[PDB]
Amino acid sequence: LMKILTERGYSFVTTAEREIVRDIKEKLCYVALDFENEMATAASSSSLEKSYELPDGQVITIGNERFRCPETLFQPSFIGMESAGIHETTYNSIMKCDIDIRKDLYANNVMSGGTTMYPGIADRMQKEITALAPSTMKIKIIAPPERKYSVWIGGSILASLSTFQQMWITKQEYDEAGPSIVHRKCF
């Protein structure tokens, strides 16, 4: 994001500017559904360039960077790795799973994590994976509201359960079972 805001002459380097570039990443960046369409739709608008503002009152402008930034996760070729996109990696992962279960992985693609907060990313993922997968089968993506924290939220709910009776990972049991207790206090 700052490697392309360099094209506007913003010589950003500090943690105090990484704060502001984080804030553009959360509050301003979106994935394109069709990169050529989102470029044409921006160029056919009377506004595409827009100001953000720093807490001290100084102003910075951002435009098409808002979707040029996210897009290299769908093709790492743009930032210059050989690596395939997240949809390609998802279907390569599905393809390397056992033939009697691949069928249900198509419908059950759970999007968690901080970078899933960009608009269009789940919507693009369903549009991308339906070109990869045999079109007899059907694809379904799911991206929660609190997708940013979803793994820790399910952890908080597990943390609150008191039914220790088939666990026994405790500071008594540790001193018999050692560091490897975690592999002998589960089924």
């Binding site: 597990l158 943390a159 359960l161 008191s162 039914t163 220790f164 009776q165 088939q166 666990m167």
Partner: peptide, 8 residues
Amino acid sequence: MASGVTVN
């Protein structure tokens, strides 16, 4: 105690 519900 960080541990799932037990069925009897």
